[PDB]
RNA sequence: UGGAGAGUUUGAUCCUGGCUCAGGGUGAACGCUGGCGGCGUGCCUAAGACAUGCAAGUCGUGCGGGCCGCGGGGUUUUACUCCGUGGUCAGCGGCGGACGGGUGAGUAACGCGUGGGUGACCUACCCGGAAGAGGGGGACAACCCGGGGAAACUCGGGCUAAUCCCCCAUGUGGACCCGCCCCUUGGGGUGUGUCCAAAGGGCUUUGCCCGCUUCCGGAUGGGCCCGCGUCCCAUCAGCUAGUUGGUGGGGUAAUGGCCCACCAAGGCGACGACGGGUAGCCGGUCUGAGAGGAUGGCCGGCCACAGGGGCACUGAGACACGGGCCCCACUCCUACGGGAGGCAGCAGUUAGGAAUCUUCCGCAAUGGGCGCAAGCCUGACGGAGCGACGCCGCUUGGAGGAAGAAGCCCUUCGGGGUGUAAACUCCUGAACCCGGGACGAAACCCCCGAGGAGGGGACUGACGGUACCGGGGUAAUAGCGCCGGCCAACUCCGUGCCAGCAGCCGCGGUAAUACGGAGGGCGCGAGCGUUACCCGGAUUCACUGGGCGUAAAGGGCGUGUAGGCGGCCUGGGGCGUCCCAUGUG
RNA sequence: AGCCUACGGGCAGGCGCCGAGGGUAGGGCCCGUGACUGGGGCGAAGUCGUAACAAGGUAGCUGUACCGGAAGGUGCGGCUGGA
């Protein structure tokens, strides 16, 4: 399960506009522009000097929350990042970004990474023609992330394309709104993503 | 409840007897030989030895005494029969022995 | 190949048998330092040739007896009682232990 | 006798087989003399079969009654074929 | 591609030092909660006792016979029997029951692991090479007759068949004594003497097939032997009569004190013998930066055992789990004379325990046995069932929506929090329904060709109306731990050294962020916590990698045995050490 | 003395060795338990003294010895961790 509970409460924890809503998060608030302080009756009192733990902890709290992913699947990836020979820090993120429920978001078929998961599990998506409803699907390079045939005509699908018109998309990605398809070009480099998280802390926290 | 493995048991009993019979006559015959072999006889000390050396290999055909265990019996037999005669005798009657 | 090793004879008492003491060097599997241990094998000497203090080669061989599974391959030298010294004195000290 | 036959591998419902020479008395998935070739019973790839025909001729040469449905996979690889 | 530390001895300080926590793991169990699937996995305890069902048979192309059914007659006709054929039942005979499947009791051992040895050995069935099958004779079951017995079974009497038993011949060959050469542990050849072979059956019968006998080789599977490796106690220090070796014998497939007679006086031990305790061992597995430690469940290999113990028979092979005999314990039958039984095989039951599954489906697939084949058996196996036990995937919605409902909580009474959360609008459409619906299965078999190589053709699916596909379609389970420090998430009230908390330091004696409830918050999420045990942290047995003036720790001092260690130059050998190759792993 | 025989032998049976285990006797190790007794640990408040830490009000500690309700005291040496 995802954080089916209130979403805008999370942003209010790192004092950072966590983009996880859609139309609203660009309105006058990710819930943010009116309440730049943590939930609960407290919070808006004099904040506490965060310990080395507090920080490294909550840094990891962002990165995960950002993709609406479970701790289970999450650390399995980080560990897997550790296995393959390379810069674990960034490598993680690339694997983290190869998520199908996330690629559809980056391709903009979906307003949020959450809406993206729903559309995906609902099979409205497809890779290289074949259908796929597994939001965890590891998206390979050269794979065609297309919208399913009977799915194209849908209104919600169109509206998200009526917003992806002209406006650019990931440098490791190609849109093609005409064919209503898309394309996963290459695993992103560190810079190509602009997550509010210092990935080095997230590694540190994974040592206890 | 009653596996017809009995057929195997009843058979072995018949087997047991045959081998028991072939085997025992082997032993009692060999004894006649060694007795006479030392007793100076040879006109028949060897004659008896033949029926032995025979009955061994014949039993060897069957599942009774088998393998080189047939050979041992023969070796440890005539090998000693010959020597028992070396107590004065010389290879008389044409026993299974070459001079 | 039939395993072989050299060692000092250190017992001539037995009939047609001798005791060979053989050392072997090897590093401690956790503490490196090369260490020496020894063992006594019962060698078959049919000719009663080899005597005490002999350094000899022995060979893995057909079982001669309960403990004898080797044969004296060949001599290496005679004067070596100096080693028999250390072995005997080792056995000397055991006295000064059990109470 | 020594026989040439198949041995199960791959998960449940997803069978595979190692065409192999082992003693008839051996267990099926048990230790075997030598693996010659695999075989997918469902052909989930282009490589749904294979046989080290070099040594296969050998074992039949030194006598090694293979299974029936083991002989089958040998005819397809045509170890017996000669012309 | 790998290594983090914290709390606690003081008034405070540095150091030593123990305790304690955060991590990972499990065949787990317990509590609270619990939606769907996939692959795994599930008596660790009493190797305690088990109702019932099934778990090893097969060949009529080895042989005669009881029975039942089909067709015919030998006979001019007939008793009826002969003859042909199918089925069934046993018997005789052959192959398999020593594989497969279960368990860890025992075992500190050449049991296991690893590398070798056998001139000291065996090997059913399969593969290659050579040679051969001539003649003659016999017994016992079935069946018939008579008896004893409750039963289980059994005694006697009479026939008979065969690939069953036996004698004579042919001896390609092989076995043995002795002699010779080669080689050199019992390896190969040769000579005289002697010893041993064979079984028939089927069809399309002048021939092909399945078998039979001897011998050599191959392949495979073993026996035995050896170097080295394999737990704690030294408050176990000495041990030993088949004991150590020898000569000759017995036994085996084969070496050996395995076993025996005779002789010699030896064998083992601080490099830990003997004894005691514990334990199946390994590939591997858990942890660790690694070295190291811990472990051996499922899986594969090896060993051991089949209620305890002993024994041999049959056999190529066994001391044989669903074979045999004997003793002990236990269960049942009994006509009291006697007799039957062995789940540590698959299910299932009972006992014990914190705890561990359906008395399911099927030989369709793979594998094994028998058979010419058809085929027969197969609780090996292929599947399904039950249990969050583990790992993985997935769902309980998505977008919008107030300067913010009611409720509940806090308040300096201005306000703040829950909270975009809900309500609300829209969208998608787990479940449920409709239609279609497998992969796993081409071979044995049939025709052409030769029954060969090659080709063509046909039957067969337990799971399963299952997976998957298409169509229609409802917003549709959230729980647990924590919130003083370590460790991170704060306020209100009740309580008053009482009630209670607790892993450590400690908290409570009427103002508790430490007890209980609430509001709120943090961490996880179909799980969350607890107990137990292992590694970690512990660099706290320190080889990597520790110390002994006062913190625990130098022997009261000497002499010296074994062991450990060892100066400068040259040379030989090449054990350690180093490198290459190869076999093995 | 029985049985079979192709009479050369075989089976049955008898005896002997060894033999599961049963019995008797004497040893060894380990576990449980035992009137009573010996010290040890733990304790929020008891009785008696005040031995130690300051010249602890007799410097302390120590091996040994003797003695005393109890800490302890004293003799003989030793140490400084006393002066
Ligand atoms: Mg949830
Ligand atoms: Mg690199
Ligand atoms: Mg006999
Ligand atoms: Mg007699
Ligand atoms: Mg006799
Ligand atoms: Mg001689
Ligand atoms: Mg001996
Ligand atoms: Mg000897
Ligand atoms: Mg003593
Ligand atoms: Mg790496
Ligand atoms: Mg740490
Ligand atoms: Mg402390
Ligand atoms: Mg304290
Ligand atoms: Mg102190
Ligand atoms: Mg303090
Ligand atoms: Mg500490
Ligand atoms: Mg940790
Ligand atoms: Mg449980
Ligand atoms: Mg329960
Ligand atoms: Mg509980
Ligand atoms: Mg419960
Ligand atoms: Mg519940
Ligand atoms: Mg559930
Ligand atoms: Mg699944
Ligand atoms: Mg299934
Ligand atoms: Mg049981
Ligand atoms: Mg039943
Ligand atoms: Mg019939
Ligand atoms: Mg038939
Ligand atoms: Mg036949
Ligand atoms: Mg008949
Ligand atoms: Mg009939
Ligand atoms: Mg009938
Ligand atoms: Mg008629
Ligand atoms: Mg007929
Ligand atoms: Mg059987
Ligand atoms: Mg059997
Ligand atoms: Mg076996
Ligand atoms: Mg022991
Ligand atoms: Mg070995
Ligand atoms: Mg091994
Ligand atoms: Mg067999
Ligand atoms: Mg055959
Ligand atoms: Mg074979
Ligand atoms: Mg053959
Ligand atoms: Mg041929
Ligand atoms: Mg005949
Ligand atoms: Mg006659
Ligand atoms: Mg006749
Ligand atoms: Mg009667
Ligand atoms: Mg009657
Ligand atoms: Mg009766
Ligand atoms: Mg009769
Ligand atoms: Mg009769
Ligand atoms: Mg002739
Ligand atoms: Mg002949
Ligand atoms: Mg000849
Ligand atoms: Mg010839
Ligand atoms: Mg000469
Ligand atoms: Mg030669
Ligand atoms: Mg003849
Ligand atoms: Mg014949
Ligand atoms: Mg015959
Ligand atoms: Mg014929
Ligand atoms: Mg051979
Ligand atoms: Mg071979
Ligand atoms: Mg071998
Ligand atoms: Mg060793
Ligand atoms: Mg010890
Ligand atoms: Mg003594
Ligand atoms: Mg003694
Ligand atoms: Mg003796
Ligand atoms: Mg001997
Ligand atoms: Mg002995
Ligand atoms: Mg001897
Ligand atoms: Mg003796
Ligand atoms: Mg000793
Ligand atoms: Mg020891
Ligand atoms: Mg020791
Ligand atoms: Mg002990
Ligand atoms: Mg055990
Ligand atoms: Mg390393
Ligand atoms: Mg280890
Ligand atoms: Mg088990
Ligand atoms: Mg498994
Ligand atoms: Mg196992
Ligand atoms: Mg046993
Ligand atoms: Mg038993
Ligand atoms: Mg057999
Ligand atoms: Mg035999
Ligand atoms: Mg044998
Ligand atoms: Mg046994
Ligand atoms: Mg056995
Ligand atoms: Mg058996
Ligand atoms: Mg038995
Ligand atoms: Mg059993
Ligand atoms: Mg059984
Ligand atoms: Mg009872
Ligand atoms: Mg009865
Ligand atoms: Mg019965
Ligand atoms: Mg059972
Ligand atoms: Mg109970
Ligand atoms: Mg059926
Ligand atoms: Mg089958
Ligand atoms: Mg099948
Ligand atoms: Mg089967
Ligand atoms: Mg199920
Ligand atoms: Mg279930
Ligand atoms: Mg549970
Ligand atoms: Mg899961
Ligand atoms: Mg919503
Ligand atoms: Mg507001
Ligand atoms: Mg409100
Ligand atoms: Mg309410
Ligand atoms: Mg407030
Ligand atoms: Mg307040
Ligand atoms: Mg919403
Ligand atoms: Mg809420
Ligand atoms: Mg509408
Ligand atoms: Mg639809
Ligand atoms: Mg239909
Ligand atoms: Mg098919
Ligand atoms: Mg097909
Ligand atoms: Mg096939
Ligand atoms: Mg034809
Ligand atoms: Mg073709
Ligand atoms: Mg067909
Ligand atoms: Mg067809
Ligand atoms: Mg079908
Ligand atoms: Mg089916
Ligand atoms: Mg649908
Ligand atoms: Mg529709
Ligand atoms: Mg719908
Ligand atoms: Mg709802
Ligand atoms: Mg729910
Ligand atoms: Mg929960
Ligand atoms: Mg917690
Ligand atoms: Mg709390
Ligand atoms: Mg108040
Ligand atoms: Mg209150
Ligand atoms: Mg109130
Ligand atoms: Mg209280
Ligand atoms: Mg609590
Ligand atoms: Mg207080
Ligand atoms: Mg209060
Ligand atoms: Mg607490
Ligand atoms: Mg309440
Ligand atoms: Mg709450
Ligand atoms: Mg969670
Ligand atoms: Mg827990
Ligand atoms: Mg514990
Ligand atoms: Mg530990
Ligand atoms: Mg320490
Ligand atoms: Mg410690
Ligand atoms: Mg101490
Ligand atoms: Mg000290
Ligand atoms: Mg000193
Ligand atoms: Mg000294
Ligand atoms: Mg002293
Ligand atoms: Mg030199
Ligand atoms: Mg080396
Ligand atoms: Mg190598
Ligand atoms: Mg008798
Ligand atoms: Mg006697
Ligand atoms: Mg006795
Ligand atoms: Mg006794
Ligand atoms: Mg008795
Ligand atoms: Mg009694
Ligand atoms: Mg006694
Ligand atoms: Mg006592
Ligand atoms: Mg006591
Ligand atoms: Mg006292
Ligand atoms: Mg004490
Ligand atoms: Mg008090
Ligand atoms: Mg007091
Ligand atoms: Mg004083
Ligand atoms: Mg005082
Ligand atoms: Mg004074
Ligand atoms: Mg004083
Ligand atoms: Mg004083
Ligand atoms: Mg003092
Ligand atoms: Mg002292
Ligand atoms: Mg004192
Ligand atoms: Mg005095
Ligand atoms: Mg002094
Ligand atoms: Mg002084
Ligand atoms: Mg002084
Ligand atoms: Mg002074
Ligand atoms: Mg002064
Ligand atoms: Zn937002």
Walk me through this protein's architecture.
This is part of a larger assembly, with chains A (208 residues), B (99 residues), C (99 residues) and D (83 residues). Helices cover 36% and strands 6% of the residues of chain A. Chain A has helices at 8-14, 52-66, 71-83, 88-97, 100-106, 113-121, 155-161, 199-205; strands at 125-127, 130-131, 145-147, 173-174, 183-184. In chain A, a hairpin with a 2-residue loop joins β1 and β2 (130-131). In chain A, α3 (71-83) packs across α4 (88-97). Chain A is globular and about 55 Å long. Chain B has helices at residues 6-38, 45-61, 69-85. Chain B has one domain (1-99): Ribosomal protein S20 (Methane Monooxygenase Hydroxylase, Chain G, domain 1, Up-down Bundle). Chain B starts with 5 loop residues before the first helix and ends in a 14-residue tail after the last helix. By secondary structure, chain B is mostly helical. The longest helix of chain B is centred in the N-terminal third of the chain and has 33 residues, at 6-38. Chain C is globular and about 40 Å long. Chain C contains 1 helix and 5 strands. In chain C, β2 and β3 form a beta hairpin. Chain C has 99 residues and is mainly beta. Chain C has a 5-stranded mixed beta barrel. By secondary structure, chain D is an alpha+beta fold. Chain D has one domain: S16 Ribosomal Protein, Chain: A, CATH 3.30.1320. Chain D is 22% helix and 24% strand. Chain D has 2 helices and 4 strands. In chain D, strands 1, 2, 3 and 4 form a 4-stranded antiparallel β-sheet that branches. The longest helix of chain D has 9 residues, at 53-61. The chains hardly touch. Bound molecules: magnesium ion (MG) (189 copies) and zinc ion. The structure holds 2 RNA strands. Chain D: It holds the Pfam family Ribosomal_S16. Chain D: One of its GO terms (molecular function) is structural constituent of ribosome. Chain D: InterPro entries: Ribosomal_bS16, Ribosomal_bS16_dom_sf.
């Amino acid at each position: 399960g995802r954080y089916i509970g209130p979403v805008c409460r999370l942003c209010r924890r790192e004092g950072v506009k966590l983009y996880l809503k859609g139309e609203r998060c660009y309105s006058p608030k990710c819930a943010m522009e009116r309440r730049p302080y943590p939930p609960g009756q407290h919070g808006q009192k004099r904040a506490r000097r965060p310990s080395d733990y507090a920080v490294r902890l909550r840094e990891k709290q962002k990165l995960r929350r950002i993709y609406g992913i479970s701790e289970r699947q999450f650390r399995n990836l980080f560990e897997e990042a550790s296995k393959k020979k390379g810069v674990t820090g960034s490598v993680f993120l690339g694997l983290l970004e190869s998520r199908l429920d996330n690629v559809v978001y980056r391709l903009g078929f979906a307003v949020s990474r959450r809406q993206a998961r729903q559309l995906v599990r609902h099979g409205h998506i497809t890779v290289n023609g074949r259908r796929v409803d597994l939001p965890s699907y590891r998206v390979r390079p050269g794979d065609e992330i297309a919208v399913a045939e009977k799915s194209r005509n849908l209104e919600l699908i169109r509206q998200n394309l009526e917003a992806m018109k002209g406006r650019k998309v990931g440098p490791w990605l190609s849109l093609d709104v005409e064919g209503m398809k898309g394309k996963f070009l290459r695993l992103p480099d560190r810079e190509d993503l602009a997550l509010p998280v210092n990935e080095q802390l997230v590694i540190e926290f994974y040592s206890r | 409840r009653n596996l017809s493995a009995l057929k195997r048991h009843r058979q072995s009993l018949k087997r047991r007897l045959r081998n028991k019979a072939k085997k025992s006559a082997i032993k009692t015959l060999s004894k006649k030989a060694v007795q006479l072999a030392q007793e100076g006889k040879a006109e028949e000390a060897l004659k008896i030895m033949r029926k032995a050396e025979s009955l061994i290999d014949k039993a060897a055909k069957g599942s009774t005494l088998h393998k080189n265990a047939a050979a041992r019996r023969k070796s440890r037999l005539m090998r000693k029969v010959r020597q028992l005669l070396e107590a004065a005798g010389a290879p008389l009657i044409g026993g299974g022995l070459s001079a | 190949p039939k395993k072989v090793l050299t060692g000092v004879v250190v017992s001539d008492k037995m009939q047609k048998t001798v005791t060979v003491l053989v050392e072997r060097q090897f590093p401690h599997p956790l503490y490196g330092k090369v260490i020496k241990r020894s063992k006594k094998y019962l060698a078959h000497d049919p000719e009663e040739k080899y005597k005490l203090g002999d350094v000899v080669e022995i060979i893995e061989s057909r079982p001669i007896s309960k403990r004898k599974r080797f044969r004296v391959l060949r001599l290496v030298e005679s004067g070596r009682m100096d080693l028999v010294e250390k072995y005997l004195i080792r056995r000397q000290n055991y006295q000064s232990l059990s109470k | 006798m020594v026989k040439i036959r198949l041995a199960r591998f791959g998960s449940k419902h997803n069978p595979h087989y190692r065409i192999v020479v082992t003693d008839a008395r051996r267990k099926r998935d048990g230790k075997y003399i030598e693996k010659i070739g695999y075989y997918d019973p469902r052909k989930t790839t282009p490589d749904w079969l294979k046989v080290d025909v070099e040594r296969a001729r050998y074992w039949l040469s030194v006598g090694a009654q293979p299974t029936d449905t083991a002989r089958r996979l040998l005819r397809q690889a045509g170890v017996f074929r000669q012309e």
